[PDB]
Write a protein that binds this ligand. Structure first.
Ligand SMILES: NS(=O)(=O)c1cc(C(=O)NCCCO)c(Sc2ccccc2)cc1Cl
Ligand SMILES: NS(=O)(=O)c1cc(C(=O)NCCCO)c(Sc2ccccc2)cc1Cl
Ligand SMILES: NS(=O)(=O)c1cc(C(=O)NCCCO)c(Sc2ccccc2)cc1Cl
Ligand SMILES: [Zn+2]
Ligand SMILES: [Zn+2]
Lengths: 251, 251
């Protein structure tokens, strides 16, 4: 499968034609305020430099594979382990976030993919209710260099080639997310890539994270993808809610 | 294992000592109104007179085996199939509901146990979030003989002895439940019997159903359990919420 065109994703995986897909357009004035939604809690996300982490250009994104021991709770009894993080972005003068807010597409988006502690593997959790949880944050252009993201963006040149990987030092993975873990949207959806399996709990932060204009150009302008094309515009079209309600942790 | 005695349930099943157990005490005061909670959808519950259904005294309860085709949804793409129903009740002058409201125990409680249709088998669903869902309603004393419950209560005689069973004509299962499918409490917990697996979505109807004083007497005074003892007070003590917030489908 590719961004850009064929083969149609439903030919790759039937679930890509499911009723309840991601990403979606968030209309905050339409979200349901759900006081049950408590602040997210993260344990083990402040990694030491060793062991190193694998950073791979898989031709679809840049993916940082995370080690065991990164724990995330959506709430009491809603426990997950971090697997990996990756990014979605656009191209020069073209934003590339997957989620939109009132139709606004942000420059880029980070996903941290988590597996429920009730499942040993991703393939057993696919299509199961709450089997996977994704933490998603918008990346916006700011005046300051982001020193957290620089640790990864300074390595993109080494993995310019599709199917390339390098080893990078451990870093504070939580420093790639917003500081406010109390204000977020939550809804049930799918993988945004084949096989597009449903039952994913999506948490989208209210607060965005700021990268510099040059950091965002590095992200969109360094990696190469399938055929002989730049890895850019690696985002899926917004999918209809089809009756799903988006919840908000805040009034 | 048995009710009020030995062995200690955590000796039979350590899962009984989990932190997110059922049943719980509901404080409607402290429940979070979640506007996303839609009316319950129950299709295929109006069974024809034949085939007949197995009703069994298993020594812990009276359990009705439900046939294939009873489909239930808690929300978009969150679908279930009904397996069985059973009851919890007290004794002469003593209430025996499992759930309580502001400390009040109701005479009795009905449980309709469902399997997520994301799982081909019950054994895959046990311990997985949302694998099982129970619809719970409190039974109260009314002035009128309940027609629905009469079909089951009139047959308790035939199965008074622990382990005995009888075939009963098909009935409308939906008629055992309360009037308003839009008004309920929901939280995540456990089986209330060993092995006390967690991941169970509990939906407790705001509204009660009414049985005659006589009907409640028949329920609590016809069945015999383990040893030579009456099958009575077959409920578990309420369990701490341990940070879980009970949600309400209604303001
Ligand atoms: N790169 S990943 O997004 O992080 C990831 C993680 C796991 C995984 O299940 N287990 C590790 C977690 C243990 O805590 C698997 S499973 C699998 C499925 C189909 C085919 C082959 C393997 C696949 C992926 Cl793509
Ligand atoms: N965008 S998402 O909904 O958050 C997402 C993306 C990927 C994913 O890594 N896709 C490839 C592009 C990024 O590396 C995976 S896991 C995986 C699946 C298929 C193929 C390989 C891995 C899981 C999720 Cl929930
Ligand atoms: N009280 S309850 O939380 O609703 C409950 C009770 C029983 C049960 O039958 N216990 C014995 C007394 C009643 O017949 C089961 S049975 C079962 C089904 C699938 C998987 C495992 C067990 C499941 C549940 Cl959720
Ligand atoms: Zn993604
Ligand atoms: Zn029960």
């Amino acid at each position: 499968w590719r961004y850009g065109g064929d083969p149609p994703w439903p030919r790759v995986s039937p679930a890509c034609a499911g009723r309840f897909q991601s990403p979606v357009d968030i209309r905050p004035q339409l979200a349901a305020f759900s006081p049950a939604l408590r602040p997210l809690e993260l344990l083990g996300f402040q990694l030491p430099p060793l062991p190193e982490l694998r950073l791979r250009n898989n031709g679809h994104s840049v993916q940082l594979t995370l080690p065991p021991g990164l724990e995330m709770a959506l709430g009491p009894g809603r426990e997950y382990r971090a697997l990996q993080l990756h990014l979605h972005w656009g191209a020069a003068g073209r934003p590339g976030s997957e989620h939109t807010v009132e139709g606004h597409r942000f420059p880029a988006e980070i996903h941290v993919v988590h597996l429920s502690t009730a499942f040993a593997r991703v393939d057993e959790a696919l299509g199961r209710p709450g089997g996977l949880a994704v933490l998603a944050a918008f990346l916006e252009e700011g005046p300051e260099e982001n020193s957290a993201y620089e640790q990864l963006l300074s390595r993109l040149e080494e993995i310019a080639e599709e199917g390339s990987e390098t080893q990078v030092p451990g870093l504070d993975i939580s420093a790639l997310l917003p500081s406010d873990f109390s204000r977020y949207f939550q809804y049930e959806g799918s993988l945004t890539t084949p096989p597009c399996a449903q039952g994913v709990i999506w948490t989208v932060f209210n607060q965005t994270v700021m990268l510099s204009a040059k950091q965002l150009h590095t992200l969109s302008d360094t990696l190469w993808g399938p055929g002989d094309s730049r890895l850019q515009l690696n985002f899926r079209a917004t999918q209809p809610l089809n009756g799903r309600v988006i919840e908000a942790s805040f009034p």
